[PDB]
Ligand binder design. Structure first.
Ligand SMILES: [Mg+2]
Ligand SMILES: [Mg+2]
Ligand SMILES: [Mg+2]
Ligand SMILES: [Mg+2]
Ligand SMILES: [Mg+2]
Ligand SMILES: [Mg+2]
Ligand SMILES: [Mg+2]
Ligand SMILES: [Mg+2]
Ligand SMILES: [Mg+2]
Ligand SMILES: [Mg+2]
Ligand SMILES: [Mg+2]
Ligand SMILES: [Mg+2]
Ligand SMILES: [Mg+2]
Ligand SMILES: [Mg+2]
Ligand SMILES: [Mg+2]
Ligand SMILES: [Mg+2]
Ligand SMILES: [Mg+2]
Ligand SMILES: [Mg+2]
Ligand SMILES: [Mg+2]
Lengths: 52, 116, 109, 95, 324
RNA sequence: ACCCCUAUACCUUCUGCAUAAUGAAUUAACUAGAAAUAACUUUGCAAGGAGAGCCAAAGCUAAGACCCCCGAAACCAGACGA
RNA sequence: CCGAGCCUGGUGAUAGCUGGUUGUCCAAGAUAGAAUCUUAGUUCAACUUUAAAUUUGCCCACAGAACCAAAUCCCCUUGUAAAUUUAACUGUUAGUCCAAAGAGGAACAGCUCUUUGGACACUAGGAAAAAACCUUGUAGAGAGAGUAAAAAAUUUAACA
RNA sequence: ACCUCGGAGCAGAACCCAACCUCCGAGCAGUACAUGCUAAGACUUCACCAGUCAAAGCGAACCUCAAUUGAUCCAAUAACUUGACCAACGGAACAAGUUACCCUAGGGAUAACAGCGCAAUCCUAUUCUAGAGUCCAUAUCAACAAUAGGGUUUACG
RNA sequence: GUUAAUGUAGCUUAAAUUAUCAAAGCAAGGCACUGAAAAUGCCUAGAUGAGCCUCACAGCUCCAUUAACACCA
């Protein structure tokens, strides 16, 4: 029912983090925080990891 | 603590009552639930007199359970409202009834009909 | 038929009693539900534990419970009480021993 | 362990001790916490920060690993840029 | 085992068997007013308090309120919520009517009476106005608790007050660099005839306030004494130290306190000028030193402590090498 | 000497054995605690010790002092047997 | 002697299992528990022993510990002399009965399972004999003395 | 039938506390995406492993829920990370039946036989008068119960 | 879990753009009536979110689903 997807930052690159979402929504796009740039940057999903 | 004089200083459920026929037992005689039907063809005259008997009861500590309404009949619709009253003493019975008599605005009829 | 129930004890309760000297960050009392509420210089964790914020001496007192108005459960319990009713809860305070610092002579300029 | 080897006649060391623990020359053993890279998505950030820590061992755990290693792993190691160089000496004990 | 209560338990006299007939708090604010009042009543258990502790005046006022409520321009401005109140008359009426009493608790809060007269209170009945001249245009007034920098208090202030012999006094209640009890005075103008302050007897000439750097915020109070008879009395700081309590004890039979004005002083750059040029000594600089952080006894085997445990017990963060 | 009074063999195993639990006729002879780093004790020398190697932020070298006996059914390899 | 011959070799196979483990004298010394293809075992803790360092340990008084019984915890005094830390390890982790609070069973068991406390596995006197009830503990000689616990009491039916 | 985790009772008031004891549940879901980094002091499921809480500080802004879970092995991935109803839940590896052809080491720690404990079951004796015995409690039998005794039985330990 | 294909009228086949037709149901017609045979209409968001052009029409985007793959102790 829930998917564990990884979210790669669109800027301040290389930094991924994992979140949950449902199977039945669209791709998540988030305003997370990068510790590389030290700003809040966009994160767009690139891969699912585990169907949970 | 139990062994201390301050035992039960913080208890509170005995101050909260968390959870009918005509009650005339030996001297303390009181009614059961009452209903007060007020029918008029004005929604303005029926809604506003439903407030005043509720304001008259609240000022005399008389318990009002429901204050709902029954729907209209298309004669022109007659609006009817029910005001549920419980508990009148012997001295209160004539006095509480006669003020609602002595405040009926314009052609609205009273009722002391009961439940079911 | 009755399976389960082999849970151990939580070992909760008061770790630092009345009158004990307690440094900042010492857990005073771990609880499951709100048995003791925090008082002066005593904080609450996520799991309702009571830790101390200053260095001092622990005192247990009884004072009037006035809940927060956004706490709609307790406010709806407050407004059912009769007109003279006052609630009480056991509070845990820390009486701070040291002062927060002195003025020391550095240098005569 | 092998208390007396069949080729030389010495103690061997358990090599599973070496790939897991770090001995400081004061006598403390330093280890990583178990599960520090397992199932990080279901852990709170406070719990994840506890796992990313080098923690010391018990008294009996330190005496068990001291028997499991020879005296080669109990010597002064004057490395160039050891990050654990400041932790080998023990300052300011009152036993 | 049960022990009976010592005094009356709460929620006991109001306790009944009927809970429907008893009227309730329907609200949160009705409960809180009863809650705040109950916390201030003394109780027989342990609480937070134990450890952390004429006829003409009414006839004139009823006539005056009936006329201010008769102008329809007033009831049009108050109803349309555009009404204002001029503060200048309210300030002048406050100092005459109840300003003595509000100035009393301000000196109780600021710790004047427990440092001036060892807990003995009085009421500043005489509304004195102390004001320091700044530049030439404006002048900085000294109310009860105000902040006046020592650059604004270099010269003596222009004291003016509406009354009819008097002594005036100033004490820096915590300016002492040596003793915790005593206080440095700044000027004592005694036997003042009526309202003219310049005619008074200077027995101590005006020192500007000198609070040391980093030593906090001082308080300096203007004592105005009602006086009947004149009495003969008596840059070195050993002459400026005295205590107000055993000074007033010598003259309480002939002289009673009658006003208050106290202000606050921080360091400024002009206190360098006072300490060096006219006091002729080095200035002292104090800093707020916090107590050292508590660390427990260092264990041999600090089990399950992080690797930064050993850093809390060393003092030099430079690598030592021992015998090598 | 006995008569009198007192006294429920021993070992092992056990919650607990006079136990009707084990073992043992008895004599003579034979028959069972082997060792490590670390600590401790005692010396030598000492910011150095050690007769190369090794250890050293009082250490280091040397000594002393702790680790049993009998018993399977089996398993495998190679011979020897109709 | 055949569910897989016999002999030699690996072989002093292995055994958490049974049996055995040899001079003298003294001293300290008994029962929380957790994990485990583990409950016939072991590892860690607890208890125990030795050596060392230090400063408190035990007993405790007011006050104090929550709402939906007996007591304990905390605790200065006081009575006392021990405890904690450090270093080095072994062994016990297959208990019994009695008193008390309960659970299971039949408000059966010399029954089973927890808890609080005794006693026993340690001597002696008693309850006849007697591990567990009662008296009593620190050791030897005496042809002295005072004591402790300590011995079951009961015999009854006329009637106007 | 069960094996892990959690709530309540036994376990009434600090903690703890068994049981093939009594009752309820859990192996998730939802909302955020600073559910960022760091760090004093502590708690701790009676060890360890893991589990908890947290001031200050940096940086910004102006988690709920009791349980809701799973170690190591260095590889799958460029990295960050992710992977077991390993549910026998401190986890070997995915390895079953059967033995009366059986063997060995042991155990009265543990069964069958017997002794013993116990007396639910069984047997017996009195108390009580309901009722049967035409009428009539007691010639005879006897319901509901009660108080004793025995130690044949089936059982239990 | 990964690779691979799949998506239809009331349901399935097909058509290489456009969408054909046999069942299903809607009546009427022959029969005393009811099933068949005709003679007629209808029923397709071509599973879809946007349209580069115009798209069953074809690539992303996709939500269901169908087979293989469900290593390595
Ligand atoms: Mg429980
Ligand atoms: Mg348990
Ligand atoms: Mg015996
Ligand atoms: Mg025998
Ligand atoms: Mg035997
Ligand atoms: Mg024999
Ligand atoms: Mg032949
Ligand atoms: Mg052997
Ligand atoms: Mg002894
Ligand atoms: Mg075993
Ligand atoms: Mg004490
Ligand atoms: Mg028993
Ligand atoms: Mg003696
Ligand atoms: Mg613990
Ligand atoms: Mg903060
Ligand atoms: Mg297992
Ligand atoms: Mg297990
Ligand atoms: Mg057969
Ligand atoms: Mg039997």
């Amino acid at each position: 029912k829930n998917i564990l997807v990884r979210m790669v930052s669109e800027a301040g690159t290389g930094f991924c983090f994992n979140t949950k979402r449902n199977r039945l929504r669209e791709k998540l796009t988030l305003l997370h925080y990068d510790p590389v740039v030290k700003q809040r940057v966009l994160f767009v999903e690139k891969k699912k990891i585990r169907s949970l | 603590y139990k062994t201390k004089p301050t035992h039960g200083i913080g208890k509170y459920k005995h101050l909260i009552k968390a959870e009918v026929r005509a009650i005339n037992l030996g001297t303390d005689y009181e009614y059961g639930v009452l209903n007060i039907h007020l029918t008029a063809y004005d929604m303005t005259l029926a809604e506003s007199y439903a407030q005043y008997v509720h304001n008259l009861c609240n000022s005399l500590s008389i318990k009002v359970e429901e204050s709902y309404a029954m729907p209209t009949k298309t004669i022109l619709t007659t609006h009817e409202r029910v005001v549920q009253i419980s508990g009148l003493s012997a001295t209160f019975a004539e006095i509480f009834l006669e003020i609602i008599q002595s405040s009926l605005p314009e052609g609205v009829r009273l009722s002391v009909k009961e439940h079911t | 038929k009755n399976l389960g129930g082999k849970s151990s004890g939580r070992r909760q309760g008061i770790k630092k009693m009345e009158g004990h000297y307690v440094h900042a960050g010492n857990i005073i009392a771990t609880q499951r539900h709100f048995r003791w509420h925090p008082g002066a210089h005593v904080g609450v964790g996520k799991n309702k534990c009571l830790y101390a914020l200053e260095e001092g001496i622990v005192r247990y007192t009884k004072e009037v419970y006035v809940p927060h108005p956004r706490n709609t459960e307790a406010v709806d319990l407050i407004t059912r009480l009769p007109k003279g009713a006052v609630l009480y809860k056991t509070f845990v305070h820390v009486v701070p021993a040291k002062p927060e610092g002195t003025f020391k002579l550095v240098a005569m300029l | 362990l092998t208390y007396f080897s069949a080729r030389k006649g010495k103690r061997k060391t358990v090599k599973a001790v070496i790939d897991r623990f770090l001995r400081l020359h004061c006598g403390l053993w330093v280890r990583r916490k178990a599960g520090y890279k397992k199932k990080l998505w279901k852990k709170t950030p406070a719990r994840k920060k506890r796992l990313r820590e080098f923690v010391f061992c018990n008294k009996t755990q330190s005496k068990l690993l001291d028997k499991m290693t020879t005296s080669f792993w109990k010597r002064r190691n004057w490395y160039v840029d050891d990050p654990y160089q400041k932790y080998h000496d023990r300052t300011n004990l009152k036993v | 085992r049960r022990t009976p209560p010592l005094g009356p338990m709460p929620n006991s006299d109001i306790d009944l068997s009927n809970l429907e007939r008893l009227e309730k708090y329907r609200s949160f604010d009705r409960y809180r007013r009863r809650a705040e009042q109950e916390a201030q009543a003394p109780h027989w258990w342990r609480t937070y308090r134990e450890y952390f502790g004429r006829t003409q005046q009414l006839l004139e006022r009823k006539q005056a309120i009936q006329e201010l409520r008769a102008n329809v321009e007033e009831e049009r401005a108050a109803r349309l919520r555009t009404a204002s109140v001029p503060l200048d008359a309210v300030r002048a009426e406050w100092e005459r009517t109840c300003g003595p009493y509000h100035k009393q608790r301000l000196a109780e809060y600021y710790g004047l009476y427990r440092d001036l007269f060892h807990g003995a209170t009085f009421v500043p009945r005489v509304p004195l106005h102390v004001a320091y001249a700044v530049g030439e245009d404006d002048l900085m007034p000294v109310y009860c608790g105000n902040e006046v920098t020592p650059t604004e208090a270099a010269q003596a202030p222009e004291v003016t007050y509406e009354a009819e012999l008097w002594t005036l006094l100033l004490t820096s209640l915590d300016g002492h660099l040596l003793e915790p009890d005593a206080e440095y005075l700044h000027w004592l103008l005694t036997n003042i005839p009526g309202n003219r302050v310049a005619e008074g007897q200077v027995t101590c000439p005006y020192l500007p306030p000198f609070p040391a750097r980093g030593s906090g915020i001082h308080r300096l109070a203007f004592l105005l004494f009602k006086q009947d008879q004149p009495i003969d009395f008596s840059y070195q700081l050993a002459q400026r130290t005295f205590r107000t309590f055993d000074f007033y004890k010598k003259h309480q039979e002939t002289m009673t306190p009658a006003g208050l004005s106290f202000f606050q002083c921080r360091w400024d750059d002009s206190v360098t000028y006072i300490f060096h040029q006219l006091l002729d000594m080095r200035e002292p600089v104090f800093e707020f030193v916090r107590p050292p952080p508590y660390h427990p006894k260092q264990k041999r085997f600090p089990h399950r402590q992080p690797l930064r445990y050993l850093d809390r017990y060393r003092d030099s963060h430079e690598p030592t090498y021992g015998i090598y």
